[PDB]
Amino acid sequence: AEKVLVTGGAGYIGSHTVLELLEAGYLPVVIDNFHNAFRGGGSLPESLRRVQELTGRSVEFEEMDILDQGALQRLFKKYSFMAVIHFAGLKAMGESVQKPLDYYRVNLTGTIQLLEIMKAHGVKNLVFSSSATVYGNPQYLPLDEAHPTGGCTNPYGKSKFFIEEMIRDLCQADKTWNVVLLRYFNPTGAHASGCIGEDPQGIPNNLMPYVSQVAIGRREALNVFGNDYDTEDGTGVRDYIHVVDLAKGHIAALRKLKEQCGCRIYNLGTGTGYSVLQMVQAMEKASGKKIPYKVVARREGDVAACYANPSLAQEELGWTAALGLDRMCEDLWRWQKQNPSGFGTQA
Amino acid sequence: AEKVLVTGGAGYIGSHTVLELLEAGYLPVVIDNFHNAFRGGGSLPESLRRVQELTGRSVEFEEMDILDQGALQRLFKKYSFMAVIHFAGLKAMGESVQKPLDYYRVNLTGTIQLLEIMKAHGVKNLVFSSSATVYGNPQYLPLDEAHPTGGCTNPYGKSKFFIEEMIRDLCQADKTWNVVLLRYFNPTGAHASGCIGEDPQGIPNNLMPYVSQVAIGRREALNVFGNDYDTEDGTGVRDYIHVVDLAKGHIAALRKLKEQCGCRIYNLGTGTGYSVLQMVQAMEKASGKKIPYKVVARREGDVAACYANPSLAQEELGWTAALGLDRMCEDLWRWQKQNPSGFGT
Numbered sequence: 001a002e003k004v005l006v007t008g009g010a011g012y013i014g015s016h017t018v019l020e021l022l023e024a025g026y027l028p029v030v031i032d033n034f035h036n037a038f039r040g041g042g043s044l045p046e047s048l049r050r051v052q053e054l055t056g057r058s059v060e061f062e063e064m065d066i067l068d069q070g071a072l073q074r075l076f077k078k079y080s081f082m083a084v085i086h087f088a089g090l091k092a093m094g095e096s097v098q099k100p101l102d103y104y105r106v107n108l109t110g111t112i113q114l115l116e117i118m119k120a121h122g123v124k125n126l127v128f129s130s131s132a133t134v135y136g137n138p139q140y141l142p143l144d145e146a147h148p149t150g151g152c153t154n155p156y157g158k159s160k161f162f163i164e165e166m167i168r169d170l171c172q173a174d175k176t177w178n179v180v181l182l183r184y185f186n187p188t189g190a191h192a193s194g195c196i197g198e199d200p201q202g203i204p205n206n207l208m209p210y211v212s213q214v215a216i217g218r219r220e221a222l223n224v225f226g227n228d229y230d231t232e233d234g235t236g237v238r239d240y241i242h243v244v245d246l247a248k249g250h251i252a253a254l255r256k257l258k259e260q261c262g263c264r265i266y267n268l269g270t271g272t273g274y275s276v277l278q279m280v281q282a283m284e285k286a287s288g289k290k291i292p293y294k295v296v297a298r299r300e301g302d303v304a305a306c307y308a309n310p311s312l313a314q315e316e317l318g319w320t321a322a323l324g325l326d327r328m329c330e331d332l333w334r335w336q337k338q339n340p341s342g343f344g345t346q347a
Numbered sequence: 348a349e350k351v352l353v354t355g356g357a358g359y360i361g362s363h364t365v366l367e368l369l370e371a372g373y374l375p376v377v378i379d380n381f382h383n384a385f386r387g388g389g390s391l392p393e394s395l396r397r398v399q400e401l402t403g404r405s406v407e408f409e410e411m412d413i414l415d416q417g418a419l420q421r422l423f424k425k426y427s428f429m430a431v432i433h434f435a436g437l438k439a440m441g442e443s444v445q446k447p448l449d450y451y452r453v454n455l456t457g458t459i460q461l462l463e464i465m466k467a468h469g470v471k472n473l474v475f476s477s478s479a480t481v482y483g484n485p486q487y488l489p490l491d492e493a494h495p496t497g498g499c500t501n502p503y504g505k506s507k508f509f510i511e512e513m514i515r516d517l518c519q520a521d522k523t524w525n526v527v528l529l530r531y532f533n534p535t536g537a538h539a540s541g542c543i544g545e546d547p548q549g550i551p552n553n554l555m556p557y558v559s560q561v562a563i564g565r566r567e568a569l570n571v572f573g574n575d576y577d578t579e580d581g582t583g584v585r586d587y588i589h590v591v592d593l594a595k596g597h598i599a600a601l602r603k604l605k606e607q608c609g610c611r612i613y614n615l616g617t618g619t620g621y622s623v624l625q626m627v628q629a630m631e632k633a634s635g636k637k638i639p640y641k642v643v644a645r646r647e648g649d650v651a652a653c654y655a656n657p658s659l660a661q662e663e664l665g666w667t668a669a670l671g672l673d674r675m676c677e678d679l680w681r682w683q684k685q686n687p688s689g690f691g692t
């Protein structure tokens with residue numbers, strides 16, 4: 001009967017996670033400030049309104065910013081949370097390098113504040129959205145949890161690293177805390193219903209949505225960011241993981257917290273890397289459409305190849321990414337086709 | 348466009364720096380929340396009251412917390428600053444390891460809030476209190492600015508490294524910013540007057556104050572944290588730097604900002620390391636008192652030796668520490684002796 005607080009729950013990964021939580025018998029309380037989520041016709045974000053329909057279960061939601069101390073305090077006072085799943089934050093839209101203070105404020109001070117409010121309310125169980133970016137430029141592959149962290153590039157990645165570090169210390173100082181830090185790889189795909197998915201605003205900065213937008217006919221050609229990398233085909237290689245598998249990894253994380261695990265860190269990836277061209281091809285196959293593209297200049301700070309060593313998670317978390325490349329592509333296409341312009345308010 | 352904001356200016360290093368600022372003709376505006384500063388009988392913290400008396404110049408002060416956005420806004424509206432010297436923060440009262448959230452809140456959130464207001468008001472000139480702790484366990488000695496940083500011992504040291512990194516990012520993103528990050532070594536000593544100095548509450552965590560307290564008779568004996576290190580005498584070696592020189596280093600930092608230097612990093616040390624025993628001996632000489640000691644276990648996480656490579660600071664900032672060991676000890680003793688209970692009770 002104790003709830004699970006889900007911050008940033010109206011977004012891509014959060015919405016899918018709320019759905020999994022609901023199906024698994026959990027009772028979420030979701031908060032979001034609409035920074036990167038579409039408002040529905042009603043009080044609920046559209047994504048969550050659809051989750052409610054898909055599951056036939058009610059979504060408890062509050063529009064709120066994690067930076068709003070008073071609101072957050074009242075929330076923790078009103079409910080008895082048994083854990084918090086923290087998705088809220090800014091991600092880079094290639095932005096971070098240019099607005100460091102926004103990233104430091106939203107991600108860093110926002111999480112510090114959340115942790116303080118959690119502590120004060122006796123809630124010491126956390127699931128944190130981390131990223132493979134913390135590893136910086138891979139020194140070796142695949143990337144296991146022991147790979148060095150904090151070496152590279154941007155304010156976004158740094159913010160994630162500083163957060164992990166802070167949580168590690170917190171756990172070190174107080175053994176009563178339990179925290180699972182999940183380093184996601186490259187989330188893709190969508191719920192199999194095709195009703196919810198990634199809903200980018202404007203020109204997508206990430207690969208897959210751009211690809212699907214081309215396939216759907218909204219964009220003429222994919223711009224491939226360099227083809228001279230030291231990879232098989234010259235294009236960047238990444239570990240794409242189905243958002244549904246990723247969402248389920250959060251449920252596994254909650255179970256881990258119940259073991260009084262202390263601080264634990266796990267990669268959430270498939271362990272299989274695919275190049276840009278490979279993804280294009282898979283999308284042609286899923287969509288049944290030809291996907292044009294043009295090779296352009298490299299994108300500043302792009303790594304050649306990145307992919308996970310998923311063993312720890314399989315072993316300790318009791319989780320594995322069950323969905324393959326075709327599934328990811330087919331699910332992405334379904335969402336895209338059924339919702340040519342992303343989320344919209346009900347007719 | 349004229350004033351210099353000094354956060355945590357009522358503290359040990361900050362009060363000495365305010366004094367130096369005044370003497371050099373700057374107009375400081377100080378803020379402090381009294382978290383680690385003693386309140387006098389008036390508005391001003393005792394330390395600042397004294398500085399005012401010593402310099403014969405007025406000290407503009409506002410009691411406030413850097414964590415208070417509203418207060419920051421009001422402050423920046425009231426005064427026109429040309430630069431900010433940021434001393435405010437929590438130091439380890441050996442505490443950091445145990446209370447991460449307090450450190451992260453005050454040091455990280457507090458500094459971010461400050462940088463935001465600075466940015467908002469177009470005051471893009473900062474001098475930051477960093478520390479040699481950012482270098483972590485020395486890989487080589489002396490420590491130059493090029494030595495690796497990060498991988499800090501504690502939540503406190505981590506906090507310092509995180510802040511340097513955020514500032515670096517800020518300067519990268521906006522070429523208009525100028526920031527001088529000062530990595531202090533081991534500050535000691537006191538103003539020659541003997542009127543102000545470090546005023547620790549409770550059992551001091553740092554060597555020097557502990558030593559002075561044993562000399563004055565407040566403590567029975569000094570506990571020496573190990574004598575089996577790979578140092579000449581087996582005891583820990585550090586680069587003790589006179590707080591007056593350190594304060595002057597901040598003035599040199601202000602002048603550096605004027606050059607539109609972007610982000611610059613400098614060690615503030617003497618380049619000379621002394622062992623625990625050498626400090627004890629020097630203090631016995633300075634005080635004329637005996638300082639009994641007992642060798643105990645190594646303190647968790649202590650480094651064997653740490654000292655600075657002062658070349659870059661001399662070359663680029665045009666600054667060098669002028670006061671040596673005897674002077675440090677003489678000044679520290681004067682303060683302790685003339686003020687057996689610090690600033691008050």
Ligand SMILES: NC(=O)c1ccc[n+]([C@@H]2O[C@H](COP(=O)([O-])OP(=O)(O)OC[C@H]3O[C@@H](n4cnc5c(N)ncnc54)[C@H](O)[C@@H]3O)[C@@H](O)[C@H]2O)c1
Pocket residue numbers: 007008009010011012013014031032033034035036037064065066067086087088089090091106110129130131132184185186187
């Ligand atoms: N998508 C990826 O490839 C990826 C990779 C690694 C890690 N992550 C991390 O996972 C999390 C979720 O990513 P996502 O793809 O779902 O992004 P998203 O932008 O769709 O989801 C984040 C949600 O947080 C909300 N939010 C932002 N600032 C907020 C604030 N101050 N208060 C409350 N809510 C706020 C946004 O409105 C949004 O709905 C983020 O922390 C992200 O950094 C994502």
Ligand SMILES: NC(=O)c1ccc[n+]([C@@H]2O[C@H](COP(=O)([O-])OP(=O)(O)OC[C@H]3O[C@@H](n4cnc5c(N)ncnc54)[C@H](O)[C@@H]3O)[C@@H](O)[C@H]2O)c1
Pocket residue numbers: 354355356357358359360361378379380381382383384411412413414433434435436437438453457476477478479531532533534
């Ligand atoms: N003394 C050292 O050995 C040492 C070593 C290296 C770096 N540093 C750093 O130099 C700075 C000054 O150190 P110090 O020895 O003078 O310490 P100090 O404690 O005497 O000075 C810090 C001052 O900041 C004030 N303060 C704390 N939190 C505040 C807040 N939220 N808002 C406003 N004021 C606040 C305190 O009341 C105090 O007067 C600190 O950032 C410290 O971490 C000191």
Ligand SMILES: CC(=O)N[C@H]1[C@@H](OP(=O)(O)OP(=O)(O)OC[C@H]2O[C@@H](n3ccc(=O)[nH]c3=O)[C@H](O)[C@@H]2O)O[C@H](CO)[C@@H](O)[C@@H]1O
Pocket residue numbers: 091092093094131133186204205206207208210223224225226235236237238276299300301302303
């Ligand atoms: C949200 C996030 O964390 N993004 C980061 C992630 O991107 P990351 O590279 O992992 O993910 P993307 O989806 O942006 O790119 C995937 C691959 O497709 C390529 N591609 C993408 C889009 C496009 O229009 N054309 C194209 O060719 C990219 O070059 C890359 O090789 O790590 C990168 C490398 O550190 C960072 O620079 C990004 O800021």
Ligand SMILES: CC(=O)N[C@H]1[C@@H](OP(=O)(O)OP(=O)(O)OC[C@H]2O[C@@H](n3ccc(=O)[nH]c3=O)[C@H](O)[C@@H]2O)O[C@H](CO)[C@@H](O)[C@@H]1O
Pocket residue numbers: 439478480500503533534552553554555557569570571572573582583584585623646648649650
């Ligand atoms: C590992 C470490 O750096 N810890 C802190 C200490 O550093 P740091 O160790 O440099 O400075 P200290 O003043 O605490 O100790 C200096 C030397 O004296 C020894 N000593 C100290 C006190 C005592 O009672 N007996 C004794 O023998 C120590 O082992 C060390 O060799 O103070 C700093 C501020 O000045 C903090 O930023 C550091 O978090």
Ligand SMILES: [Cl-]
Pocket residue numbers: 040041042043044049
């Ligand atoms: Cl609704």
Ligand SMILES: [Cl-]
Pocket residue numbers: 228229230304
């Ligand atoms: Cl390469």
Ligand SMILES: [Cl-]
Pocket residue numbers: 387388389390391396
């Ligand atoms: Cl007064």
Ligand SMILES: [Cl-]
Pocket residue numbers: 445446447448449
């Ligand atoms: Cl804490």
Ligand SMILES: [Mg+2]
Pocket residue numbers: 309311312
């Ligand atoms: Mg393994």
